[PDB]
Design an enzyme around this catalytic site. Sequence first.
Site, PDB file in Angstrom:
ATOM      1  N   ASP A 176      -6.094  31.926  26.646  1.00  0.00           N
ATOM      2  CA  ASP A 176      -6.145  32.483  25.299  1.00  0.00           C
ATOM      3  C   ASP A 176      -6.548  31.427  24.265  1.00  0.00           C
ATOM      4  OD1 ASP A 176      -5.916  33.968  23.016  1.00  0.00           O
ATOM      5  OD2 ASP A 176      -3.725  34.267  23.117  1.00  0.00           O
ATOM      6  N   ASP A 190     -12.509  33.576  20.655  1.00  0.00           N
ATOM      7  CA  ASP A 190     -11.194  34.039  21.122  1.00  0.00           C
ATOM      8  C   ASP A 190     -11.269  34.760  22.473  1.00  0.00           C
ATOM      9  OD1 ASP A 190      -8.568  34.836  21.457  1.00  0.00           O
ATOM     10  OD2 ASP A 190      -8.530  36.249  19.747  1.00  0.00           O
TER      11      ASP A 190
END
EC number: 3.4.23.46
Length: 393
Positions: free
Chosen positions: A40, A236
């Site tokens: 992440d 992201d």
Amino acid sequence: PGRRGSFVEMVDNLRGKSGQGYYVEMTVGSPPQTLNILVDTGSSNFAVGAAPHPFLHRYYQRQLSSTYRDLRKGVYVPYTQGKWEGELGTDLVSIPHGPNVTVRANIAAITESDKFFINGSNWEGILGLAYAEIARPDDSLEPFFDSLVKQTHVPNLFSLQLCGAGFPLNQSEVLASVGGSMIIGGIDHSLYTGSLWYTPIRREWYYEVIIVRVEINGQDLKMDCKEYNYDKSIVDSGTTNLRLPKKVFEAAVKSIKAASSTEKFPDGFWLGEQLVCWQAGTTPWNIFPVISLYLMGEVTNQSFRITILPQQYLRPVEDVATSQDDCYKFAISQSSTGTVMGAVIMEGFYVVFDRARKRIGFAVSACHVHDEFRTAAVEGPFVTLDMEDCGYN
Ligand SMILES: CCCCNC(=O)[C@@H]1C[C@H]1[C@]12COC[C@H]1CSC(N)=N2
């Protein structure tokens, strides 16, 4: 020269898909407890399931770890779509298909959650790879990658090749299939074609970048470039879609509809809610436009562009019925928190998070999905003035 791949130990260490995330195997504790962990780049905590949950097959058991240290502090983490709470501590952590090192890192042991763990995702925790500024509960909780670099000789850089299949995979097929590579401490030349082009990291919090121009099939969207970065633009891996600020989304969708106008799609498709299906093999890729995002370059007044295909922004999904149809959702959606270059964008590219040099590199991925007529691209340079003005304050 022919491209040599110098990080064989770490190639093919990811599994997963854009809808549910890409994960890497890690171990925590002594003796080691194996867990699958979401990669992440949009958050900064290492947080792992630490109690039974209907969607967890396993979890971190602190009482079985001789090296567990309790930090005697709780953390409450509410997101837009989901929440969890847990207990802070530290333990020894390793990545089996990673550098041959073990580090002591912060771990948030998740004790309660709502709409966080995803049924069938295969991951039991998340590895937030962004910077301390956005760590919870505050910036004193050193992120994993910071600990790794401080405690070892691993270079301050990692690189991600997320490999979308271009067709649906069930939970079993995800388990059996390689989903890409996370190269920790280096760049593996086998994972990309052509040149790497670098954009500055504007500020070390998120991996924030500046977009200076947007084209749909070569046609300039022609918005003030501040709009593209309102209120930020980030890279992201923990978001599925390309997300665009509301006004940019509206303009892009209008342009993508116009380019694809030989076929009419329902509003639910453009809103990212409804799947569309075609007979096996007949997906009309050629009616959908390419999308180019121009990024600030490292040289004054220079930009470069990354170009994605509908094979990136149409996300393969299984039919809601039983069919051999090829079905997809539109994986571009609106944001009120700035541009998010999510997994479906990253699937086009080998992405180098060069923390040491405060820059992010893009090259065409060796595993991007394409057709015989068009490929993803990374191209430059372009003369572009006043690029700092594109940044939002
Ligand atoms: C492609 C994976 C889809 C599912 N994503 C998640 O569950 C992400 C782990 C969360 C968070 C953790 O902070 C906010 C939250 C939403 S956005 C983000 N980058 N990370």
